[PDB]
Every structure is written in C-alpha cells, then in structure tokens.
TrEMBL record, chains G, H, I:
<dbReference type="InterPro" id="IPR036252">
    <property type="entry name" value="Proteasome_activ_sf"/>
</dbReference>
<feature type="domain" description="Proteasome activator PA28 C-terminal">
    <location>
        <begin position="60"/>
        <end position="120"/>
    </location>
</feature>
<dbReference type="GO" id="GO:0006508">
    <property type="term" value="P:proteolysis"/>
</dbReference>
<dbReference type="Pfam" id="PF02252">
    <property type="entry name" value="PA28_C"/>
</dbReference>
<keyword id="KW-0647">Proteasome</keyword>
<protein>
    <submittedName>
        <fullName>Proteasome activator protein PA26</fullName>
    </submittedName>
</protein>
<dbReference type="InterPro" id="IPR003186">
    <property type="entry name" value="PA28_C"/>
</dbReference>
<dbReference type="GO" id="GO:0008537">
    <property type="term" value="C:proteasome activator complex"/>
</dbReference>
<dbReference type="GO" id="GO:0061136">
    <property type="term" value="P:regulation of proteasomal protein catabolic process"/>
</dbReference>
<dbReference type="InterPro" id="IPR036997">
    <property type="entry name" value="PA28_C_sf"/>
</dbReference>
Amino acid sequence: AYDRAITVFSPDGRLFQVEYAREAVKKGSTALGMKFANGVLLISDKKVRSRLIEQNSIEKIQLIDDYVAAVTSGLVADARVLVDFARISAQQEKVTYGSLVNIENLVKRVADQMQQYTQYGGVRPYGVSLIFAGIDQIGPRLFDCDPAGTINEYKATAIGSGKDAVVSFLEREYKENLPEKEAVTLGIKALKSSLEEGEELKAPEIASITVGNKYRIYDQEEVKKFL
Amino acid sequence: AYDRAITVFSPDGRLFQVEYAREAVKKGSTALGMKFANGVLLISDKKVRSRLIEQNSIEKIQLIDDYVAAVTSGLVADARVLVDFARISAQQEKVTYGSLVNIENLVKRVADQMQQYTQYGGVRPYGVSLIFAGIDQIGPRLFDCDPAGTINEYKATAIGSGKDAVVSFLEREYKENLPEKEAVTLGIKALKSSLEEGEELKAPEIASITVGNKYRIYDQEEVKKFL
Amino acid sequence: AYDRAITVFSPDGRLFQVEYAREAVKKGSTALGMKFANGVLLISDKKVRSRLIEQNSIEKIQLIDDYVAAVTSGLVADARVLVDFARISAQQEKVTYGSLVNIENLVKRVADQMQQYTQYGGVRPYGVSLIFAGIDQIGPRLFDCDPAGTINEYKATAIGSGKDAVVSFLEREYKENLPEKEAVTLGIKALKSSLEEGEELKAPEIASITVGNKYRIYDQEEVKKFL
Amino acid sequence: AYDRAITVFSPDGRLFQVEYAREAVKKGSTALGMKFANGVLLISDKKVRSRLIEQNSIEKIQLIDDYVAAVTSGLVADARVLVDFARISAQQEKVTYGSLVNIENLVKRVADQMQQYTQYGGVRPYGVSLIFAGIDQIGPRLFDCDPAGTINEYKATAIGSGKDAVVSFLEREYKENLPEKEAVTLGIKALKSSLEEGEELKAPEIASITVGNKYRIYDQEEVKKFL
Amino acid sequence: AYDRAITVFSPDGRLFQVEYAREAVKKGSTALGMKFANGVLLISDKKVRSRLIEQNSIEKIQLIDDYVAAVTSGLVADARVLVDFARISAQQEKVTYGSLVNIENLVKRVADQMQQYTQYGGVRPYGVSLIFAGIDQIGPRLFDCDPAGTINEYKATAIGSGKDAVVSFLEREYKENLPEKEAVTLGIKALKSSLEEGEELKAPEIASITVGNKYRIYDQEEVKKFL
Amino acid sequence: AYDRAITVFSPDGRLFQVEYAREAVKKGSTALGMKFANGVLLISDKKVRSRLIEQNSIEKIQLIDDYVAAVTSGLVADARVLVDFARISAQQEKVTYGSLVNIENLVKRVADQMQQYTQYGGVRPYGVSLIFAGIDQIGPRLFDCDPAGTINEYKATAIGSGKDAVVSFLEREYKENLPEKEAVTLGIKALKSSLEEGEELKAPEIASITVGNKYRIYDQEEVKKFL
Amino acid sequence: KRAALIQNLRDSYTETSSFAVIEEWAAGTLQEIEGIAKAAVEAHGTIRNSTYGRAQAEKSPEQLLGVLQRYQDLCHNVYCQAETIRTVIAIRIPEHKEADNLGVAVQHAVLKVIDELEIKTLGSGEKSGSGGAPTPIGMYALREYLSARSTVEDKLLGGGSQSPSLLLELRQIDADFMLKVELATTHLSTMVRAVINAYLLNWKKLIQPRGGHLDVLYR
Amino acid sequence: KRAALIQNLRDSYTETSSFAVIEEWAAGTLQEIEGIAKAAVEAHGTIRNSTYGRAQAEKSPEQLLGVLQRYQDLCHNVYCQAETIRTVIAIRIPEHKEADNLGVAVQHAVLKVIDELEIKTLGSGEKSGSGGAPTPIGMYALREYLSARSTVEDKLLGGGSQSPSLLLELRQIDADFMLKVELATTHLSTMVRAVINAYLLNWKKLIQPRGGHLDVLYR
Amino acid sequence: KRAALIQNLRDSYTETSSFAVIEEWAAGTLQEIEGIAKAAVEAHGTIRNSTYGRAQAEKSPEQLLGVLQRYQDLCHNVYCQAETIRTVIAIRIPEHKEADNLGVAVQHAVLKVIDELEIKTLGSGEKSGSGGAPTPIGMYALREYLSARSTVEDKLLGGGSQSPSLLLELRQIDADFMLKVELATTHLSTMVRAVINAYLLNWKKLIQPRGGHLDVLYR
C-alpha cells in the first residue's frame, strides 16, 4: 500500500517507486563497456529488428561529444530525453569552461536532474540507466547513472537485463590495460555469457576512444570479425 | 490498481496509462507510407462517410509545409492540436534557421511536446500517433511519433488498427528504390491485406513528393486507377 | 471507476468524462443549418416557454458578427460563455487582420479553447456544441464545434437531441444549391421528422445570409408561413 | 458517488454540485418583481424577526445604484459578497463609460463571476440567486441571475422557496403596463398565494422606479395599505 | 460523507464545515452588549482562572481604537489573529480617510476576510465570532461577525455558549435609551439567566462609550457593585 | 476520521491535528519560570545524557538577546527552528525600533508564525511550546507560546510533561516579589513535585535577569547548592 | 404501448390507497392489537391460578383457541395491508441509474423497514438456525400450539405416563403460549408505529423518487 | 463461425418474445392469481365454519386439492415464463471489461430481481436454516399438504389416538394451508408487478448493454 | 524441462477442443434438453389424468424411470463437457502478478459462470441449509425418486395404512417429480445459452490473458 507515491517511505525505509523504475531499467537490452590502456570502449547488444528501420536510429550508443559518449537501457522515450539533456549540458559546460574539462560533472548534471524527480510528488522518475565513457583532462572515464541518480566511476560495468551476469563475468575475468582488441574480445565473451541457452549473439554495436583521438564506431564488418 | 495515474510504475515497471493512450491510437484507421527512389509517399485509408461532410476536412494527411507533411490516427481532437503544433514548430524552425533544414527536429519538437505529458500529474497524454514524411537537405525522410514521444526513422511503416498487418506485409515484401507508381501499388496491396474479410477497400487518400519538387495529392481518379 | 477524472484513459482508451460532456450536449433542443446557392441558413427549435420571458433573450441563434453567426445546445451557462468568447475572438481577429477574413480560425480559437479543458485536471469541459455559419472571403461556411473541440466543415448538420434523426434525414434528402426558400422548407421537414409522436412543431427561429449581404432573422410571421 | 466535485459530470451529464447550490437558493425567502408602464418594481417577503435587529440591515432589496437595484435569496454570506461585487462592477462600468449605460452587462459581470466558480476545482459556487431591476438607456429592465450564472431577462419573476408558485400565478394572471399601484397589488396577491395554510403575510419590503426618476422604497405604512 | 471539505454542498444545500466552525464558536464563554441613550456597552463573562495569569491578557474585550472595541468567542488562536486584523484594518481605514469615519466597513474588512476562507479548499475558516461596538459619525454602533462572515447591526446581542438564552432574555426585556447604569444592570441579569443551576456569576469585564467620549473599562470594583 | 487534516473541524468543532501537536509538546521534559522582585528566572529539567555530548548544545534555555531569553519543549528540530526565528525577529524588531522595546511583539512574531501553520493544508504545525522571559521598557515579562500560537503573559508557568503538576504546585504556593534565591528554591520544589516516585532530580539549568542587568546562567555548582 | 401499461399500474395502486391503509393502521389496528393483548393478559393469569390433572389433557382450552385465532387473523390482515404499501412503493421505483439515487435510497430504506415488519408478522417455528432475533410466533400460532400440546396429550393419555413434570409441562405450554402472544402484540405495536412514522415522513420522496425541472438548466 | 452462433442464439431468443411474456403477465397471470386467491379465501372460511370428527380423517378435501393444484400450475407457468426473460437477458451480457459497465449493472440488477421472484416461486419446505424471509410454499404445496396431513391421519386412525388437540390440529392444517396459499398469492402479485415495472423501464439498456459510436471520437 | 510440461498441457487441451464442445452445446444438447422437456410435459399430464389405488403402489412407473434416466445422462454429459472448458481455461491462467490482471479477471468471471452451471447440474437433495436458490434436482433424480416413493410404498403395503392422503401423496410424488424435471430442463437451457454467449464473446482474452509487445516500449 506504499508503492504508489514517489514520496513515501516503507517502515523498512525503502522507496518502492524508485525501485520499480530500477526494475523498468532491467527490461532493456544489455550494454557494457570498460577502460583499457589509454582509452575506453562500449559494447551494446541489439536483437536485430525490422529491415524497414533505418539502422542509424536504433543505436543504443550515442555521441554526446567528439570526446564523450554513452549508452542507455530502459524506457525509450525517457532514454532519448536523457541523451538530449546530456548533450545540452555538455554544451553548457563547454561554453562556460572553454572545453569539456571533466566528464564527471557532465554526469553530475545528468545525475542531479534524474535525482530530483525521485523526490517530488506529481513527477515520476526516469526509467533509464546511462553509462558514460570518454577522455578528459584526466584520461579514460567510465560512469553509470541509475534512475535514482547514483553515479559511480568504474573500470568496467554493464546495464540492462544481463547486467548481473556480465558484471559477474568481468568480476572474475577482467584485467586492466589490455590492448584494445583483446579488451573488446573479453567484453564480447562477457556479453555472450549473459544470454539464455539457444540464443545466438547477433551483431552488437561497439565503439571506442583512445587518448588524443576522437571516437569511432566499429562498422558491422569490423564487428563481424569478433563473432 | 496502478493504471489510474500517469506517474506511477507497476512492480514490473510499466506505465499502463501511456499504454492505454497507445491503445487509443489503435482505434483509428490505418495509414501508411514509405520512401522510394528520390522521395516518399503516404497512404491513408478512409471508410467513406456522410456526403454532407466537405471532403476537404476529413483528410488524415495534412501539409505541414510545402516540403513536410504527415498523417495521424487516434483521438480527433488531440490529432488536430498536434498537427497544429507541427505547423507552428515548422514555422519557428524555418524562421530561426532561414528554412526547414532538417525534418528531424521538427519531429523532435513534436516528440518532446508529446513526451512531456507522459510524466506530469494533472495532464493526460495525447492519444494520437503521427507519421511525418518529406524532403530536407538530406533527402527523403519518414518518421513515426507515438504517444510516449518515441520517434524512429523508417523506410516504411503504418499506424492505426491495421499497423501490425501492414508492417508484417512490408516486412516481407518491401524493396527500396521503386519508381513511384510501383511503390504506390505495393502500398495499396499492403493496405488491402490489413482489412477483414468481406470488406472492400474504398478510395484512400495518397500523396507524395520527389527530390526538388513540392507535394501533390493524387486526386480521387488518379487514386481510382490503382483499385 | 475511470469516469471520474478528465485526465484518465480507460483500458480501451476512452475519455468517459469528455463523452459525458457530449451526453450533456444531447439534452439540448435541436438546431440545424445548411448552405445553399450563395449563402447559408440556420434553424433552431424552441419549445415555447413562459410569456413573462422577453423573447429577445431565448434565441439559440446569436450574431457573432454582421457576417458570422452561430447556435448552441447544452448547458446554458457554458453556452453563453462560449458565444461571448466567439464574439471576443471575432473582434481580436478583425483587429489584427482588418476584417474577419476567414470564419475558420474564429472557429479555431473557440475550438482550441474548448479543447484545452479536456486535458487538464481541476477543470471540467464545456457541455455545449456550437454550429457556426457565415460568409467570408471564400463564401458560405458551416462548422460544428463539439465539447472535445473537434471541428468539421459541412454542407448540412444539426446538433442537440434530434441530431441523429436530422442528419439521417439530410443524409438522404439534401441536395445543394437550393434557392433559399426551398432550402428552408427542406430543413423544416428535417426538423419535423426529429420530434416524437404527438408533438407539434412550434415556431422555430430561422435566419440566413447571402453572398454580399448581412444577416437577417426571419421574424415569427415570415417563419409562420412554413408551418 | 458523483455529487462530490464541482468538475465531474454524471453519465446522464448533470452537475449535481451546481444543482445543490440551486437547492441552497430554494431555502431562502421569496422575492419577486416585474416591470410595468414606465418602470419596474420589486417585492420581497420578510418573516419579521428580533426587534433587537436594526431593520436597516435585513433588507433583501439593495440599491446598487440610484438607477439599478436588486434582491437575493440563499446563503447570506455569499449574498452580501455578491451585492458588493454588483456595486463595484457598477462603479467600474460607470467610470469606463461615463454612466451605467445598460444594466445588462452589469448583470454580465456578476454572471461571469458566478459562472466561473462552477467550473474550477477547489472552489464552491455561490448559493444565491439575484434579481436585478432598473432603468437604463433602453428602459425598464428585469433579470434573474442564478448560481450557475444563467441570466434571462423577464417581464416578471420570483426567486426563493415560493418561486414556482409565484411564477405559476404570474404565468396566468400578469398583464403588462399596469399603473404602478395595480401592479403592486397583483404582485402582493402573487406573494400571498405562495405561503402555506395558516401563515399570514407580514409586511414585505417593496420598492420601484419609473422612467426619469430614481428609486424609492415604500416605507412600512405605504406598504401597510396593501395588506 | 460531505462534512469533510469546505467547498462541497449537501443535497439539501448546506455547508457543514462552516456550521462546524459555528459550533466551535459555541464552546466559548458568553459575551454580550447593547446600545443605549448616547452610547453602547459590552459585557463578557469570565470564569476566573489561575492567579498566575496576568489579568491583562485574558480580557475578551479588546480596544481596536479609542472609538471602536470588540469581543470574541471561540478558538483563542483565531480570536487573537482576528482582533489583530481588526486593528490593522482600522489603521488602514483611518489613514486613507483621515479618521475611522464609519465602523461598518471596518466590520466589512473583517467580514470579507472571514468569508473568503469559507470558499476555498486548503483553508479552514475561523472558529470565532466577533461583536463590534463603538461611536462613529453616525453614533452608537453594534455588529456581530460570525464565522461565515455574516454581519448584522443590532441594538443588543450576545455570542458564546449562552447566546440563545441571553438573546431570549433581551428579546423580551430590552428597552432602548436606558441611562448607562440601568442598561448595565439589565445586561447583568441577561448574563445571569444564561448560566446553569448552582453556578454563581463571577466578576465579568464590562466597558462602555458615550457620544463624544472615549472608552473606559469598569475596573473590578466598579463591576463589583452590580453583583 | 477527522484527525487527518489540519483544516477540518469535528462536529463538536475541534482541531484534533492541532491538539496532537499539543500532545507532542507533552512528551518533552519539564521547564518552568517566574518573575519576582525586579526580574524573572527560568528553570529547565534535564535528565543527564551521554558524556560524549558537549553540554553547550543540550541547553533547553537559550538567549535570544542579552535582554530576552526562552526555553522549549517538544520536537527538537522544530524547537531549534523556532528559537532561530525568535532570534531573527528580535533582530528585525531591534533594527526597526532601535532596541527591543517590548518583548510582547517578539512573542507576537513567533506566535503569528506558529499560528499560520495551523490553518493551511500541506503544512503541519510546530510541535513545540516556548516560554519567553526578559526585561523591557515595562519590566519583567513572562509568556508562553503554544503550538496553536496562543500567547498569554503570566507570573509563573511551566511547559512539558510535568506542566500540570508544576502549575498545580505554583497555583497554591507561589507568592510574588520573592528575593531571587527564595524564588529559585520555590521553583526547584515545584520541579521536584512533578517527577515520579523513585526519580531523583538531577541538576537542572537555571538562569535569571534583574532590572538593569543582563542575563546570567547559574553554572552547575551554583545550581548544586539548591539540590 | 408501454407508457399506457405503466400508467395503468400506477393508477391502479396509488398514494391514496396507501394512505388509507396508513389511516387504518393509525386507528383501528392499534386498538385491536391492544384488545388481543389484554385478552392474552387475562388468559395468562387464568391459566396461572390453576392446578391440572388428567382431565385437562382431554379437552382443548377453547378460550386460548379463540385468543390465538384473533391474533392469527390480525397478523393476516396486517401482512396484506403491508403488501399493499410494498406494491405502491415498488411500482414507482424509477429507471436504474448510477447517479440521482437520493430518493431511490429513501424507497429502499422504507421497503427495508416494511421487510422487518413482515418478517416478524409472517410466522415461523423455532427454527434454531438464525443467530439474529428469534421471531415471535406469527401466523402459525394455533398450529404450533396444537402440535406441542398434542404431543404431551399423547404422552399423557397413551396406559399413560407417570411424570408430574409432563403434566406441569402441559400447564406451562398453556401459560407460555399466551405469554408469547402478549410479547408478540407488544412488538407488533412497536413496529407498526415505526412504519407509520416512516411513511408519513417520507411519502413525498416515495411517490416522487426524483423531481425534474431540467429545462431551467438545459436549453 | 462464432458470430453466426451468437446471432443464432439472439435471433432465437429476442426482445419481442420477452415482451410477449411481459404482456401475458400484465393481463392474464394477474387475474388468474386473483381468482386462485378468492378461491383460497372462500375455502378458508368453508373450513373455518366446521367441526371435525373421525370421518374427516378418512377422506381428503378434494376442493383444497384443486385449489393447491391450481396454485401449483400457476407457479410452474410463472417460473418458466421468468426463465424465458432470464435467458433473453443472459444471452446479451457483453464482453467482460473493467470499464463501461453502466448498462451491464442494469442487467445484473434486473437479473437479481428475477432471482427474487423465482426463489419465492420455486418451492421449499420449512427449511429452518435461513435467517432471511421464509419462503411461502411454492411448487410443493400439494406435497407438503399431503405429508403433514397423512402424519395426523396415521396418528388418528392407527387403534387410534385420543388427543382432541390432534383432531383440531388436522383442522388447523386444512385452514392454515389455504391461508398460506392466499398469503403466497398476494406476495406473488407484488413481485410480478415489480418485475413488470423493472423490465418496462430498463428494456433499452437490457437489449443494448452499451451503445457504440466511437467513429465520431476515434478516426 | 518446465516449459515442455506447460506446452504439453496446453497442446493436450486446446481452444479447438473447447470450441468443439461449444458447437456441440449449440446444436445437439439444446434439442436433447427440449425433447426430454416435452417427454416430461407429456408424462406430467399422463399422471394427472389418473386416480390411484393399491395397485399403483406395487409397480414402479417405468416411463417415469426412463424420463429420469434420460435427464440424468444429459446432466452427466453436460457436466463432463463443462469440466473440459474449465480445464482449458484453467491451464492458461498466467503468472500471478499484482498488476496486468485485466484478462485474468475475464477468466475468473467465465470460470464463475461455469461454476454456476455445474452447481446447478450436479445433484443435490433438499439440503434445507442454503438461503440461496434451491438447486433443481440434478444427478440424483432417480435416486431421490425411488427413495421418496419407496417410503410411501412401505407405508402403504406394510397390514397397510388407511390414509387417503398417503395415496394422493404417492400420486403427487409421481406428478411432482416430472414437474421438477421440466423446471430443471428449462433452467439448464437458460444457463447453457448464457455460457455459450460468454465463451463466444470472451475466448480471445480467455486464451490470451495478456498480450505482450514490450519490445516497442522497452529497448
């Protein structure tokens, strides 16, 4: 009888509405990423859909800058609104400081925005989690921003329905400073071991950055190598 | 007990109110469209009504510009309010950039407008889906904007009560770059195979655009050819 | 359990509150009108009441301009507020464009006003439908504006409790471009065939306009001819 | 289960809250008035109360101007607030137009004010009905403004608990252009035939105006004649 | 099920919340007053309390001016807020007109203030009634302002738990223009006959004004005479 | 079913929410004070707690000025917010009048602030009572401000859980104008007779002021004398 | 035509018929209940001041038979007159809507009261199944009397039995059923006067379940 | 095909069949109830003005048998005609949704009323288990008559018994069951006229549980 | 594997099996009910136009035995065919969630209706415990017939009894149980046609308790 309002605690002291938004994240497809020797990558599973769909607009990975990029999972409407707010806050940060100096408070803008809606009545939170990654003045970065707003900087994570299995794999297999290719293949195996039996891993979008370089997205045939 | 407010998630994590607006879209008549070799068309079914009605104001297809146009399905009141907002945002985009440069962020204005009402209490969303189509600096475009605000650029789609059957047909029959006429007849067959048994396809409004040209609407006797 | 708020859809996807406002329109007396060879008329039934009432203020037909006029049905309070807003919007339209150029967006002002209250909590909609008619730069016009705001331009319609029977008659009898008198008598027969058995049609108010002329209201003895 | 909010329609399409305000009017004492040959009068029943009460402040009839006056029935608090708003709007109309040119839109200001509270949540309507009467540029006037805001100009009416019986009498007895005295005595008989058996009509306040003159209130002994 | 909100009528048409505020007035101790030959007095019962209480701040009678004064009954918090608003409005009236010209619209300011809270949700009304009395340009004045805002000018009244018995006494005993002393003793007998059996009338605060003079409060031994 | 909102009266006419705030005051520890020959003191019981707590910040007595001081009981959060508002209003009073001229309307600022929250929905009241005391232009002062805002100036009182027993003692023992020491010991006996059997009175904070002097707080060994 | 049939029912059972039944209950029924109650009072003490033997088991007490018969006829007349008012109310239950049921609830309440009157006027033996109020006898008083008496008469006549408690039980049957009669008459007086109160206060809403003047608001 | 089967049911049991049943109840059923009631009235006093002996326990009262048989046949015909209306309403209960149930609730209410009519038309002995209204006899009147009479006839014939209260109990069985007949006919008149009222006011919502013109709002 | 077992159940009892049962009820069951009803009609009047003696208590009416046997076999077949539809619905009740139960409530409603059909098809004696609708006989018609007849046959044969009301009670047993048969067949017709309506309107939600296309919203 308490999971009806965003502003009411349980007698345990839980926010079931916030947790249901976290559950709504869990219904989205798995997407992971990690940093390595001078840079970070991202991997995102896509169960291939209608060939009538222009492939340009089903990319879970999105470029928020030439030097910051991210990926979502959850409600598709809230997902797009969020990646928009990430872009706009990147622009405001870049204009008030001359450049995107640190990725961390771009993630802070997004985090405080997503946090605020977990506190006021008449508003529902965002049912999306976001994984930011890029290069700043410090170097390779990797965050995850959840519905409640909580951000944590990692060396590797996932989000989505697989997230537990992928972080379980990486938790016992990941070793830092891999040269880019080896890192990617480790992450591919991580993504593989999250599917259910019988499911064949289709072609996932993967993109990376190295220190001093911009992004690039591996096209489908560079992806096709690591199948 | 949760499908009463726009701002409350289920313990699965669903927004049943948003889904009911999507259901209210489903009660509208089928309308489809696709791009082809230099341009895009639209097709909209109309079960012919009262001859006292001026045919000028039952057109589900509407011109938002000489170079952008769209079609709706769902609540007729919200439908008209939406096509109005599309026109006004087209005017604002055209005045701040000198021309409608890209159709995509006209669709973004409409999308963010429709998205916002899926988040705040005291407001119901729009029970209408919209299919935009036109020519920009890039070329042939084709979107669909749903009640939750989600936009996706396609090469072919429908909306309305048939939508599943039409996209099922196009999913196994559509081949790109058809010369305009052949494309139209394929779309007519698509629209045909969505009706129920015994129903005869009446005369549907169809209109198109090619690269470097404005719209035109096929009048009823140019339509009458493809019966 | 869903017909309590203006902002909640049913799992079919219906707005029962908007529908109940449409039902409240249905309790009002029948009023019809149609265009003809150079102009439009209006007919409104009145079951004759207390002779203490000054007949000047029971007229369901009202002049919004020398060139636009309309008629209501439903809640009398909301009815009067609406015909007021129609007059004021006609004045604002006439001052920003020098003349009431087209009747259509006078009807749009009224339509958007009536639509807005079908969307926000804390407000009930208007339980009135309005039939506009007049002469513009284009010519004879005839709209109907319902509680949800939906407007449609016809060649003939009614509103009120009879509306179905009258539009049923006109749907199989109306032929355009009648000379004014013949048109009026057709509409009188239309109004007649909507009553119940035993009821005698009393004297209804009827008024018209022709291209290049102002309105006039047929006085009761010019009305008395067509009994 | 629907008569709890001002903003919810029944599935018939009624506004029970507005109707309950109309019922709250019915608990007030009867007051009537009519126009005659060059002018209008008002009659108001008063069941005589405590002699400690200064008779100056129990007058249901109130002067809103030297040329407009009215009478209420219902909630005494809302009654006084309404006659205040009538006075203030008379002042504003008089200052923007140099004089109270027409009584009708004084009644409109009061009507729109009372109408607005029958539409918005968080507000209850006024449980008072008002009968305005006076002399303008046109001549003798007589309105009644109900809780919903509906105004109608009559030649004779009442309000209050008797209203049906009085208008029933006037509906079969009233003949216009009576010289003032005869009119008053007709209205006295009207007021008499609304009481219950055994009740003796006490002394009612009655006041009038003629074309070119101000008001006057018949004092109690000029009233005492027509007993 | 209707006595829960300030803004909902019963199907009779009553405002039970307003009436419950009137009931909350009834729990306060009796206080009365009347005018006489050139002036007005006030009498207020006080069941004598803790001798630790400074007698200066238990006076139900309060001076709003050197020429206006009043007395309350009901909730002591709302009581003090009201006598504050009376003082402040007296100051504003005195500064915009040079002097407190008429007591009546000081009472109007207080009345409209108390009335407004009987109309809007989210606010409860004041559970206090006030009896104003003083000398103006006209002469001796005596009002009572109830929770609903209703004001009435009397020649004698009470408020509080006794109010019915006191006004019942005065209704059959009061004769105007008594010389001050005789008036006071009549009011003392009035206050006496409102108590219950066995209760002995303690010392009540009584104060008066005459035309051309300021107030004074009879001190306890001038009070002690009329025991 | 009525003790749920701050804005709803019972059919008796009570405000149970306000009374529950008064009950929340009752759960706090006893604190008392009285005036004497040229000045006032305060006494506050403290059941001695953790020696980790800096004794500086458990003082229920607080200095709002060098010449005004007070003590609370109830909710500790609301208590601190209130003594803050007392300090700030003392500063505003002192700057607009050059000095804290009278303590009474400092208490009025606090009183109106605490009263306002007992009237509007969406706000809960303060569950704290405050006892002000000091020296002004008039002399020794002593108020108590309760949750509803009601202020009363006394010669002696308490607040808290003992309040009834202490005021019962003082009601039969207190005699004014005691020289400071004797007054203190009387108040100590008053505080003693409010405890339960077996409880030993620990060391209570006590502080005073005399006419022409500032405050001082008796330190614990000057307190230790009167044990 | 449908309206003709509805009008035919309502003109058949009208308010003046109902109010004539109410006038009959207001005068005659009450003094008849009181007279039967006084007869029960007298017969109770008549049985009480006696001592029985075998001879009383050989003849039925015709005085008690007459008292029971009078009470039975009264309950029949009261039940029929109650069913009249039931029909008068029930043929004016309006069209079933989900709103507007203010006057409808008045009709349901009055029908509920008449249900109580007729459930305690209609007869019932000791059912030993209901946890509510056990119904004082009702219609089948003379039936239950003769059954419970005839069992003891069989046991006493046969050779016959020897239990003196059986003979005293026969005596207690006689006095006890007259006691039950006077209890039931007191309760019937109570319930009838309650029904008269309810009808005479609510008859306007009973005949008009809702008033309609929608032409004032809707035009 | 499914729609063909639904249409086959509704064309089989239609509104004109239901309304013909309503017309039959409106005329003939009511005067037949009244005639059986008058026969019960006359037979009651016929039993009342008599004194029984052993000879009345040797032959069944064929007049009372005929009255009970007429009432039994009436209750059978009324129950079958009620089941007709039940089926007419029940084959038009729409698709079960969680909204839109305004007209559906009307159907449930009318079915609930017909349930009361048929639970007090169908027969039941004195069950002594229900705390509600005990049902006046119903279908099994002649059964219950012959059972309760045959017990006393066995006790009187055998040697036979000697209880005079047993003989008077036989007399009371005779008069009492005719009394029960006239009570039941009065209540059946009440309930039938209530059902006629309910149908003739609600038949439009009974046949159309909801109206659909969604093409006006949804396009 | 679990999904294999669920699929094994659903492939065993599918919608076409349920709809074949519905087609069988739509044609054959109804005319069989009607034929048994007409046989009950004819046998009722056959008993009615007769006068019994000792000889009718010596032989059972084999015609009535055949009518009861036909009704019993019909009720058995109807109950088994109803249990088929019960199982078809019950093996598709989805995962129990606190939301999404729109289609689930449709399944509960249809199961509730089938419960009424089978509680009035399954047999029951006069239980005298239920305050609701007394169930017309059901399965145990021939059982209850032979029991209630054999009691009276014992009392008539023995020397035998002398009550003429006992002999007429035997006659009333015969006519009355055929009357109960025709009542029960009418009610079964009503309930079966109601169930056919409910299934043919709700079968889509019965087979799919909820539709899932969450990939449109969740990605």
